[PDB]
Design a protein around this ligand. Structure first.
Ligand SMILES: [Mg+2]
Ligand SMILES: [Mg+2]
Ligand SMILES: [Mg+2]
Ligand SMILES: [Mg+2]
Lengths: 72, 207, 83, 226, 126, 129
């Protein structure tokens, strides 16, 4: 319903885009730093570990099976 | 026309003022504004006659140019115009439609009432709107007699007149027959016509 | 429409309306080709030659072909002046 | 064996002047913007080249006291590859008759498309004459000229009408819920139909006015079939 | 109850009347035999119902004409009234006369005889 | 307020072309409007035009043909420098065979086809096709 078109408004446009990028989900997730901390991998693709004991995760209602996961 | 053989004569202005054809309605619409002379002291508009005459001769010039006389279908739905269209179709060989219209007669290729005209004359744009709306589907021009409060949508040659009273409507159809028959050849000018306008008037059930 | 050799490469040349100069498409089932007659200038009888007018669907739908034909005729001696 | 098929006894004034050889091409029909109401007018002029294609069959249905009452909707595209194209759609109870009634509408809606040159006019126009747009209920289709040899840069569905219309090169774009094939196809057909309804400085020469086919053949129509 | 006739009965009776108008009278026991001899009704109950509706239609055609049956005798009385009649004359008196602003209009197209005038109260409803 | 006079002159011309009008009146007049109209008329998109002169800014009456399809303004007057010009006339124009871009150069208000013919950039004003 309105955006400044004028010739000396580069600062307003640039600052508004920079301010509003922080509402995109993936942008914030990648540039904040909370996900890299909460990620059980250190930001890596793979990881080695030790098996504590095997477990029997039961699948969600429309299916029925016992998925046989492990605890690492 | 610009000429003198086609100019209005004193004998016809008396027919006009006798039938009352100059007497308009109470409401005006912004498309009929060029046909009005001036609004009376009481709220009623006078139709300009010289303008009625030119639009009537333009309609005659549009009808004469059609070669087959039998695809100039003429329509009337109100009770005042039925005898007039029946007599107009008799005098010059059009095909009349009085009464209901039975929608789809122009756009339906099954019906037995399906015809394909090349012109369309009509008594009253605001009472025979179905033929206009259907002509708007098959590339069909239209001539129409307009009161001062007639909506000029889908009409192509409006003829201004009092459209309400029976004498006016019959007189207009009679004059339209006179001028097509005159300029097609046939009943040549410098003679009165055998038919009197009263053969074209509404019956208005009698004694 | 031509090309650099000069020939005309086109399916057809559509007609244009006589009141608004916009072309008349191939599926405009509201446009007309009103044809009016010419009289013989002395006895006021029809003689062959006649004039033709095209009106597009849009300006016919807005209720303006009536006062457009009147102008196309008055411009052209069918009515001369003093309507 | 038996022979002598005598189908197509016409029911309209145009069917008469078409079946009788009086009328030459459907360009003379398009020039006067007449409505074509018989599917044999098309097969008279075209027909040896019109190839049809079933774009989609789509099962729709109404809920009912007893049931869900399903019936199928067929989208068919048709057209010879040299400047004519059409697109029809019919909903019927069984597929075999929907696909047959849709070809009739696809043939009845055939329009002529205009082709132009991109850079210079060497011969045999190859692309659209200008940027055109077309809509059908929140589906916008943009057609843009392209140099010779680029092909058709578009989605699968518009690059099935664009081919049939006779266009060799085109840049296309869409910005919409294009996943609904009905609106996508109808918007592409609309963009193609707007190609002859675009005033262009070569279309500025005043119109020479010809006789309508109904005025020229009045004498025939007066008694050619009865 | 019922006694409402069906379209198969009404259409049959209308056709029977519209063709054999002059053989049908006002009594039922003769119309029954007439319709029996002119048509083929494949039942006797249907024959009686058709012949009973024919009588009820005939009792009406003797009055003003109905709007679904067209006969010859009742068309002449329309035709011979749609052609001119001495009840009508010309324009009733050819000395019809006008008000001002019409004479002011007629003056602008060169008219000059046989008229009158009047001026009203100066606005509506006074 | 009326920040931009040319913008509303061109939008009022274009709103009437969509309507079939034979003439428009546009006000106030200005030096740049008359030059843009002269450029648009030299090619044949509009007919003659008349300037009505009050003792103030004035008014113009334009005779509209039916040839104009769209005329319009570019809202900030950007600088255009004979290399951006191709990328500009690939956004604004509908084809490569017709339609013009109007720009003000130090040699007057002209079109792109003359700008390249005289080797000059300038500021973009608008376009018509
Ligand atoms: Mg928030
Ligand atoms: Mg989330
Ligand atoms: Mg995202
Ligand atoms: Mg989706």
């Amino acid at each position: 319903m309105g955006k400044c078109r004028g010739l000396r408004t580069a600062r307003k446009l640039r600052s508004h885009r920079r301010d509003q990028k922080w509402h995109d989900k993936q942008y914030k997730k990648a540039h904040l730093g909370t996900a890299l901390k909460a990620n059980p991998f250190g930001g890596a693709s793979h990881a080695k570990g030790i098996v504590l004991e095997k477990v029997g995760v039961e699948a969600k209602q429309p299916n029925s099976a016992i998925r046989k996961c492990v605890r690492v | 026309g610009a000429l003198d053989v086609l100019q209005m004569k004193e004998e016809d202005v008396l027919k006009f003022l006798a039938a009352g054809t100059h007497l308009g309605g109470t409401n005006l619409d912004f498309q009929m504004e060029q046909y009005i002379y001036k609004r009376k002291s009481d709220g009623i508009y006078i139709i300009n006659l010289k303008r009625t005459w030119e639009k009537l001769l333009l309609a005659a010039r549009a009808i004469v140019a059609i070669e087959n006389p039998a695809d100039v279908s003429v329509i009337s739905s109100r009770n005042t115009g039925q005898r007039a269209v029946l007599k107009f179709a008799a005098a010059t060989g059009a095909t009349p439609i009085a009464g209901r219209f039975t929608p789809g007669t122009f756009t339906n290729q099954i019906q037995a009432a399906f015809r394909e005209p090349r012109l369309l004359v009509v008594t009253d744009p605001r009472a025979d709107h179905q033929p206009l709306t259907e002509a708007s589907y098959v590339n069909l021009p239209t001539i129409a007699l307009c009161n001062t409060d007639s909506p000029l949508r889908y009409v192509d040659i409006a003829i201004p007149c009092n459209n309400k009273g029976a004498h006016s409507v019959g007189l207009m159809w009679w004059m339209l027959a006179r001028e097509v028959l005159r300029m097609r050849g046939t009943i040549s000018r410098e003679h009165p016509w055998e038919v009197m306008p009263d053969l074209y008037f509404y019956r208005d059930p009698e004694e | 429409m031509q090309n650099d050799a000069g020939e005309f490469v086109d399916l057809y040349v559509p007609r244009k309306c006589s009141a608004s100069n916009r072309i008349i498409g191939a599926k405009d089932h509201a446009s007309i080709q009103m044809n009016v007659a010419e009289v013989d200038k002395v006895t006021g009888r029809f003689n062959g030659q006649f004039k033709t007018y095209a009106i597009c669907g849009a300006i016919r739908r807005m209720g303006e072909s009536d006062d457009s034909i009147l102008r196309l005729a008055k411009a052209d001696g069918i009515v001369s002046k003093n309507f | 064996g038996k022979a002598e098929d005598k189908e197509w006894l016409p029911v309209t004034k145009l069917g008469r002047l078409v079946k009788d050889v009086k009328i030459k091409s459907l360009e003379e029909i398009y020039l006067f913007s007449l409505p074509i109401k018989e599917s044999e007018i098309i097969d008279f002029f075209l027909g040896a080249a019109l190839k049809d294609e079933v774009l989609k069959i789509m099962p729709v249905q109404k809920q009912t006291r007893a049931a869900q009452r399903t019936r199928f909707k067929a989208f068919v595209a048709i057209g010879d590859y040299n400047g004519h194209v059409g697109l029809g759609v019919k909903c019927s109870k069984e597929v075999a008759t929907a696909i047959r009634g849709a070809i009739i509408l696809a043939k009845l809606s055939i329009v002529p498309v205009r082709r132009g040159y991109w850079g210079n006019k060497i011969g045999k126009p190859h692309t659209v004459p200008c940027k055109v747009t077309g809509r059908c209920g929140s589906v916008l289709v943009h057609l843009i000229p392209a140099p010779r040899g680029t092909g058709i840069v578009s989605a699968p569905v518009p690059k099935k009408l664009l081919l049939m219309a006779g266009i060799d090169d085109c840049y296309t774009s869409a910005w919409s819920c294009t996943a609904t094939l009905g609106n996508f196809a109808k918007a592409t057909f609309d963009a193609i139909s707007k190609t002859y309804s675009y005033l262009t400085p070569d279309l500025w020469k005043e119109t020479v006015f010809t006789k309508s086919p109904y005025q020229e053949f009045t004498d025939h129509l007066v008694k050619t079939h009865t | 109850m019922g006694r409402v006739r069906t379209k198969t009965v009404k259409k049959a009776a209308r056709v029977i009347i519209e063709k054999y108008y002059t053989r049908l009278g006002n009594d039922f026991h003769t119309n029954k035999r007439v319709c029996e001899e002119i048509a083929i009704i494949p039942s006797k109950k249907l024959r009686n119902k058709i012949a009973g509706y024919v009588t009820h239609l005939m009792k009406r055609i003797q009055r003003g004409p109905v709007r679904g049956i067209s006969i010859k005798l009742q068309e002449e009385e329309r035709e011979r009234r749609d052609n001119y009649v001495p009840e009508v004359s010309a324009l009733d008196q050819e000395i019809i006369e006008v008000d001002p602003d019409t004479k002011e209009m007629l003056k602008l197209l060169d008219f000059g005889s046989l008229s009158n005038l009047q001026v009203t109260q100066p606005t509506v409803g006074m | 307020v009326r920040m931009n006079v040319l913008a509303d002159a061109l939008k009022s011309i274009n709103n009437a072309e969509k309507r079939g009008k034979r003439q428009v009146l546009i006000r106030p007049c200005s030096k740049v409007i008359v030059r843009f109209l002269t450029v648009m008329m030299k090619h044949g998109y509009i007919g003659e035009f008349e300037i009505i002169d009050d003792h103030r800014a004035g008014k113009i009456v334009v005779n509209l043909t039916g040839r104009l399809n769209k005329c319009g303004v570019i809202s900030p007057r950007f600088d255009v420098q004979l290399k951006d010009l191709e990328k500009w006339q690939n956004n604004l124009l509908p084809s490569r065979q017709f339609g013009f871009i109007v720009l003000t150069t130090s040699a007057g208000i002209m079109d792109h086809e003359e700008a390249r013919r005289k080797h000059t950039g300038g500021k973009i004003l608008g376009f018509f096709f």
